[PDB]
Amino acid sequence: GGVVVDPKYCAPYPIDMAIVRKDGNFVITDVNGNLLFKVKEPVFGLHDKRVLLDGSGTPVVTLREDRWQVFRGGSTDQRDLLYTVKRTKLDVFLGHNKDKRCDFRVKGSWLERSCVVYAGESDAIVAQMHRKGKDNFSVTVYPNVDYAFIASLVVILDDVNR
C-alpha cells in the first residue's frame, strides 16, 4: 500500500528529503545532497503546472492545478491520472477512488515544519517532516513508502504556502 507512482521509488530504509533553492523551480535531493528530483514550471508564464524530473531530466510526474491532479511522467491526460489532492490538512484519493475514504491525508503545519502524511484506512504514518539556500526542514519517508509520491505533496504544500 506504499506504491503510488512507481515501486522503484520505494526503498527498504528511511530516506530523508531536503529542499534547495538557487516561479517555483527548486530541487529536492537527499540530505547528503544527491538530487532526487528537479521541480519546475513547464511553461514560461504558467504557474499552475509543475513537473518533477529525475536527474536525467526525465519527467516523473506532472502536477496540474484548492485542488491538484498529479499525472504520470510528462502528461496531463486523464488516462495518466495517478491521484487527486484536495485542500485534516490535505486528503489524497488515488485515481481509481471515484468516491469517501482517503488513501492518504496530510495534517500538521507547513510553517511549523510539522507536516505528517498518513495512510487512510490504517492511519499509518508514511512520512514525517522535522524542523532543522536549504529550507528549514527535512522530511523522512518511511521504508517502502513511495518517495516520489511524498515529494509531490511537498511540492503541493510549498504551492499552498506560495
Which domain CATH number covers 98?
A: 2.40.160.200
Q: Are strands 59-64 and 67-72 parallel, antiparallel or unpaired?
A: antiparallel
Give resolution, Å, one decimal: 1.7
The set of long-range contacts for 59-65, using a CB threshold of 8 Å and a minimum separation of 24, is: 60/5, 60/6, 60/9, 60/148, 61/5, 61/148, 61/152, 63/152, 63/155, 63/156, 63/159, 65/159
Query: How many domains, the chain?
Result: 1
**Residue with cell string 510549498:** 158
Report the amino acid identity of residue 63: L
CA-based end-to-end distance of the chain: 31
- Per the CB < 8 A criterion, the answer to whether 106 and 115 are in contact is yes
Q: What is the CB-side half-sphere exposure of residue 131 using CA atoms within 13 A?
A: 7
**Domain hosting residue 31, numbered range:** 1-162
**Residue with cell string 496530510:** 106
The set of long-range contacts for 72-77, using a CB threshold of 8 Å and a minimum separation of 24, is: 72/5, 74/42, 76/49
Sign of CA dihedral 41, 42, 46, 49: negative
- Per the CB < 8 A criterion, the answer to whether 18 and 34 are in contact is no
- Per the CB < 8 A criterion, the answer to whether 55 and 35 are in contact is yes
From start to end of 95-145, where are the E strands?
104-107, 116-119, 125-131, 137-141
To the nearest 10°, report the CA torsion of 146, 147, 148, 150. Answer: 100
The CA distance from 36 to 29, in Å, is 4
Q: What is the CB-side half-sphere exposure of residue 45 using CA atoms within 13 A?
A: 0
Angle at CA 147, nearest 5°, toward 162 and 99? 75
The CA distance from 137 to 122, in Å, is 26
**Residue with cell string 499552498:** 160
Q: Are strands 59-64 and 104-107 parallel, antiparallel or unpaired?
A: unpaired
Neighbour count for residue 13 (Cβ, 10 Å)? 8
Which of 135, 134, 75, 144 has its CA nearest to residue 111? 135
Which of 136, 74, 89, 80 has its CA nearest to residue 111? 136
Q: What is the CB-side half-sphere exposure of residue 23 using CA atoms within 13 A?
A: 3
